[PDB]
Amino acid sequence: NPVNRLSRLINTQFWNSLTRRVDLNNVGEIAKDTKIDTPGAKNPRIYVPYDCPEQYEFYVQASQMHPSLKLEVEYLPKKITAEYVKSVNDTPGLLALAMEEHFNPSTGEKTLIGYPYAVPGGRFNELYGWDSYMMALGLLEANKTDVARGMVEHFIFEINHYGKILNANRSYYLCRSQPPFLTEMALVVFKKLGGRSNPDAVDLLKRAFQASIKEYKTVWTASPRLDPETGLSRYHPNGLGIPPETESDHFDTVLLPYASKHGVTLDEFKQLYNDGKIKEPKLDEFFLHDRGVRESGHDTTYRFEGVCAYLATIDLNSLLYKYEIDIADFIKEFCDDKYEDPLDHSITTSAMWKEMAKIRQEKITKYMWDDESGFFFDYNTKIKHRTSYESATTFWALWAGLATKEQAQKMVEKALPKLEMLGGLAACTERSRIRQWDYPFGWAPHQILAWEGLRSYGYLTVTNRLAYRWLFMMTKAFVDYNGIVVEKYDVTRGTDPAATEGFGWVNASYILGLKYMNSHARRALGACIPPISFFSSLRPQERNLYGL
Numbered sequence: 001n002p003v004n005r006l007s008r009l010i011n012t013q014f015w016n017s018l019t020r021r022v023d024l025n026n027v028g029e030i031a032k033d034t035k036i037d038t039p040g041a042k043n044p045r046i047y048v049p050y051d052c053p054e055q056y057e058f059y060v061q062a063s064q065m066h067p068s069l070k071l072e073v074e075y076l077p078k079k080i081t082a083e084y085v086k087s088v089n090d091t092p093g094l095l096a097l098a099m100e101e102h103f104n105p106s107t108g109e110k111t112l113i114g115y116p117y118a119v120p121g122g123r124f125n126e127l128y129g130w131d132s133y134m135m136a137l138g139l140l141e142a143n144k145t146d147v148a149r150g151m152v153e154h155f156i157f158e159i160n161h162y163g164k165i166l167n168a169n170r171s172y173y174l175c176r177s178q179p180p181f182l183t184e185m186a187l188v189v190f191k192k193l194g195g196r197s198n199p200d201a202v203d204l205l206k207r208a209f210q211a212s213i214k215e216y217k218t219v220w221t222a223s224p225r226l227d228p229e230t231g232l233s234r235y236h237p238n239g240l241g242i243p244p245e246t247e248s249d250h251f252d253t254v255l256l257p258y259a260s261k262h263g264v265t266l267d268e269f270k271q272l273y274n275d276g277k278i279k280e281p282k283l284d285e286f287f288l289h290d291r292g293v294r295e296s297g298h299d300t301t302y303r304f305e306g307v308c309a310y311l312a313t314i315d316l317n318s319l320l321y322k323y324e325i326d327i328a329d330f331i332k333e334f335c336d337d338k339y340e341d342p343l344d345h346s347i348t349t350s351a352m353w354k355e356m357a358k359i360r361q362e363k364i365t366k367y368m369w370d371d372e373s374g375f376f377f378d379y380n381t382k383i384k385h386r387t388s389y390e391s392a393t394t395f396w397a398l399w400a401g402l403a404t405k406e407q408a409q410k411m412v413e414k415a416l417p418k419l420e421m422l423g424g425l426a427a428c429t430e431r432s433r434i435r436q437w438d439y440p441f442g443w444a445p446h447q448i449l450a451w452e453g454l455r456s457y458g459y460l461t462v463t464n465r466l467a468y469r470w471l472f473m474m475t476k477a478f479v480d481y482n483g484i485v486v487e488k489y490d491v492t493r494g495t496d497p498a499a500t501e502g503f504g505w506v507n508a509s510y511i512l513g514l515k516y517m518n519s520h521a522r523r524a525l526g527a528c529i530p531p532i533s534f535f536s537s538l539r540p541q542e543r544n545l546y547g548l
């Protein structure tokens with residue numbers, strides 16, 4: 001049965017293939033980076049913060065065992081400047097992450113070994129920000145918790161030492177980030193470890209919310225990201241120059257007009273721009289929006305390219321609402337409703353946080369919600385106007401819990417039909433739109449968040465329907481492509497003419513979706529029954545379970 005075959009592969013072979021753990025021997029296997037080709041990328045390299053002498057010894061000694069790798073270890077400055085990262089552009093490296101202390105019981109000798117984590121797979125050998133929530137959900141269903149806990153330990157380390165949750169842990173990501181899930185990601189691992197019963201669980205919960213509170217204040221509600229007028233946050237990374245990790249050809253088309261304006265060859269224009277010599281304001285802004293699109297994880301989409309820096313997205317501000325609610329709960333329970341940030345000595349109560357979320361919910365509705373169309377749009381903070389682009393991320397409002405019941409149903413009735421395709425939810429409506437993250441492409445995170453969001457607001461029959469559509473499409477591809485799991489899916493079309501690891505959040509979308517399926521539906525999936533045929537075959541009251 002292909003449903004059980006795919007599931008079984010995801011739970012065992014796939015996650016193991018994607019799992020990474022740093023020991024002394026595997027460095028340079030973990031440090032492999034194909035995305036940046038340049039003379040500095042030939043030898044493996046790791047960067048370490050100035051706070052971690054013990055980690056420095058670990059990796060330094062790692063180079064001493066296997067000089068074959070020619071691995072180079074380098075400390076990092078206490079203050080990491082945008083200019084500084086531009087300097088390591090041509091000499092990249094992997095960033096150290098959380099380490100687990102393991103003591104010899106007889107002789108007490110302490111050895112360091114990395115916490116486990118999952119990579120998205122393939123070209124991406126690093127821990128990524130918003131993939132890791134998706135994967136951790138799937139790993140907790142596969143009952144590998146240590147892999148999920150490791151990533152939480154990593155996000156904590158990322159926030160303290162690197163100042164935010166990184167797009168991924170590499171030199172060239174140090175100014176970027178990605179949509180925050182840390183609060184909810186901490187809760188689901190807390191509950192799996194046994195909750196308050198487990199003292200290690202409670203410890204972890206506190207450290208993750210301590211870090212979450214700092215990420216909130218110092219990153220997302222700080223400037224430049226925070227818009228003072230609206231009080232809503234935008235994606236505004238401080239990265240400088242042209243991002244190294246793209247294709248050498250990638251930007252050549254937009255750069256070429258500027259080079260001709262400056263009368264030099266493009267390859268010279270590239271170098272002189274990265275040397276700061278050319279000052280072009282209009283182009284400096286473009287690359288600013290580019291880095292903002294890469295911080296949104298949606299690179300690339302038409303609602304963003306040339307648009308989103310100034311944009312306050314339903315995406316980010318929804319996940320912030322979840323942060324504010326989660327933080328409030330944490331303080332009221334474990335902090336006795338009094339929390340004083342040890343950094344700035346700021347006292348806060350749950351009532352205050354619960355307040356802050358109420359204002360956010362008000363201001364989101366003010367600047368975003370549209371009752372006629374049923375969508376949450378994004379607000380441009382520069383020109384002070386609302387976007388017309390209909391996006392699938394509007395369901396994050398449900399996932400966060402900031403929408404009113406009235407908003408939700410108007411959104412289910414009016415908004416959902418335009419996003420619901422054969423394979424589930426397209427990333428945006430056809431009218432709103434060949435880019436990557438636009439129609440006709442569905443993406444796993446969009447599905448996962450909408451499933452749980454729709455469930456919280458009381459529609460799980462819609463989730464059953466949308467999950468069937470997605471799992472059917474994934475199952476048919478598994479059998480038609482002979483075990484190949486593909487990263488991207490066209491939800492409006494059918495099949496076509498190393499997948500041993502799959503792709504992390506696609507794997508997780510499959511299992512998370514199957515929880516919503518009863519045994520009748522799982523069997524229909526094994527037969528590769530299309531949704532139209534499956535639904536029409538059900539007794540009318542069973543068909544109600546799918547919202548039909």
Ligand SMILES: OC[C@H]1O[C@H](O[C@H]2O[C@H](CO)[C@@H](O)[C@H](O)[C@H]2O)[C@H](O)[C@@H](O)[C@@H]1O
Nearest residue numbers: 120124128131167245246294297298299
């Ligand atoms: O072209 C390089 C870009 O790759 C990443 O973005 C993709 O990979 C991530 C992990 O799969 C996803 O979270 C993301 O949604 C994808 O768009 C990276 O995030 C970008 O910064 C790179 O520029």
